[PDB]
Amino acid sequence: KIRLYQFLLDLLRSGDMKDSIWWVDKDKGTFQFSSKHKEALAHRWGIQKGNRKKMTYQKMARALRNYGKTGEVKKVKKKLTYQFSGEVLGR
DNA sequence: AATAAATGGAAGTGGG
DNA sequence: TCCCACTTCCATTTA
Numbered sequence: 001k002i003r004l005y006q007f008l009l010d011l012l013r014s015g016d017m018k019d020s021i022w023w024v025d026k027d028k029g030t031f032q033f034s035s036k037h038k039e040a041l042a043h044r045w046g047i048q049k050g051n052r053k054k055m056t057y058q059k060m061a062r063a064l065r066n067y068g069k070t071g072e073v074k075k076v077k078k079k080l081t082y083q084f085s086g087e088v089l090g091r
Numbered sequence: 092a093a094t095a096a097a098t099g100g101a102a103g104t105g106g107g
Numbered sequence: 108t109c110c111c112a113c114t115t116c117c118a119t120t121t122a
Contacts, residue, residue, distance in 0.1 A: 001105085001106080001112085003112075003113090004112085004113075035095080035096090046114095049113085049114090051104095051113090051114065051115095052104085052114085052115090053114075053115070055114085058096090058097095059113095059114060059115065059116095060114095061096090061097085062098095062099080062113090062114080062115085063112080063113055063114070065097095065098080065099070066112080066113075075097090079095090079096070079097090080096085
């Protein structure tokens with residue numbers, strides 16, 4: 001049962017959806033979603049999870065928000081931009 | 092207004 | 108029982 005932050009890190013490693021997500025500064029772990037193409041990536045997350053409903057970027061971003069306190073992923077002050085923790089990057 | 096994004100509480104679902 | 112790790116729904120706010 002893959003975790004959302006790992007799904008995203010795995011995508012950034014593989015390059016399979018390079019038009020939906022990309023590194024901004026990979027050394028810092030900052031990454032950004034495509035305004036126009038993020039929904040396709042959200043859809044893939046829902047299908048990988050086997051969720052009942054179609055996944056949307058908004059719901060996926062709601063899940064990302066919950067990582068802010070524990071630290072795996074923090075929202076950066078640029079649109080659609082986030083940052084993985086050093087711990088997540090190391091694994 | 093139209094569109095997009097952000098904020099985030101609250102309740103529901105999984106699989107322990 | 109009761110937390111995990113989200114998912115789903117909704118109202119609101121900002122640009």
